[PDB]
């Protein structure tokens, strides 16, 4: 295997997914240069669980999932095992036993617009918390009250998604961040993804 892992495609994608509709890219049968990601000044978040970031090029995995999406600066801390909040509860949930790295960086100059970028959505209402790696892309009117909605928006009958309104003059806590979550899978099978 002399296929150099297409991390460029994940990290430098012109378009990123909404967090409710988070994108998963399967990385298989490939060589991973993690060192060019970690040994840089690019990433304000680079947190690994069950593994060390200096050692990543020494490691072999069955497969690697790369999940990616945009959220607010203030929400990046919710992309971790054991976190609560709208994002962890209703949008993207890591399992307690997560093995992988959460990588984020400020995308203000790409994902903010004067007058606001409303492209990026998050789910604001849901009857219950997501299971780890559950993807809910439904847009059913959320019944807040005791009267049923029957698809009519009204009082206590809400569209369940809301837009971030990314403006380049927002406080950095409210500025967009691109997030990439790398899951390292190990099971009784040939490890397909390995450092150089």
């Amino acid at each position, epitope marked *: 295997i002399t296929n150099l892992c297409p991390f460029g495609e994940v990290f430098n994608a012109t378009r990123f997914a909404s967090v409710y509709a988070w994108n998963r890219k399967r990385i298989s049968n490939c060589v991973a240069d993690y060192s060019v*990601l*970690y*040994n*840089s*000044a*690019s*990433f*304000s*978040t*680079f*947190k690994c669980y069950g593994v060390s*970031p200096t050692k990543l090029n020494d490691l072999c995995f069955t497969n690697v999932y790369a999940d990616s999406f945009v959220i607010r*600066g*203030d929400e*990046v*801390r919710q992309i971790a095992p054991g976190q609560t909040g709208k994002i962890a509860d209703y949008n993207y949930k890591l399992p307690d036993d997560f093995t992988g790295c959460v990588i984020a960086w*400020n995308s203000n100059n790409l994902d903010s617009k004067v007058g606001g970028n409303y492209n990026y959505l998050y789910r604001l209402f849901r009857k219950s918390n997501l299971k780890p790696f559950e993807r809910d892309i439904s847009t059913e009117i959320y019944q807040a009250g005791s009267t049923p909605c029957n698809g009519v928006e009204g009082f206590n009958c809400y569209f369940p998604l809301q837009s971030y309104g990314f403006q380049p003059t927002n*406080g*950095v*806590g409210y500025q967009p961040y691109r997030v990439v979550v790398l899951s390292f899978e190990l099971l009784h099978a040939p490890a397909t993804v390995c450092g150089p």
Partner: nanobody
Amino acid sequence: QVQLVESGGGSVQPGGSLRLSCLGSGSLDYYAIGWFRQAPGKEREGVSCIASSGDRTIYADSVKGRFTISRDYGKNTVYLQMNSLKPEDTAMYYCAALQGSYYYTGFVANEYDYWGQGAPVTVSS
């Protein structure tokens, strides 16, 4: 997953020096450490930052050649050496830790996860 304990504050006259200390409960090896300062009324301001790699540092324009940041990995502490002190330096000083890429530095308070209790600095006109 770390706590920061500061020490080294105090009063001084203009041209005096102070040495701040940020001691980590857990390993600070993976963390960049930032020093922010807060004066009553004024906005919080990033003073200095050192990357996890210990060989990238940034400084606010007004403190270049006055303040030096350093870290001892062995002693798991970060230091702000504060020389040539001036009344404008009067503030509460806080160290903070973030976990970014090896060379990452910044003054974005929201990107920092852990904050020290804060050390007092008074420069007496």
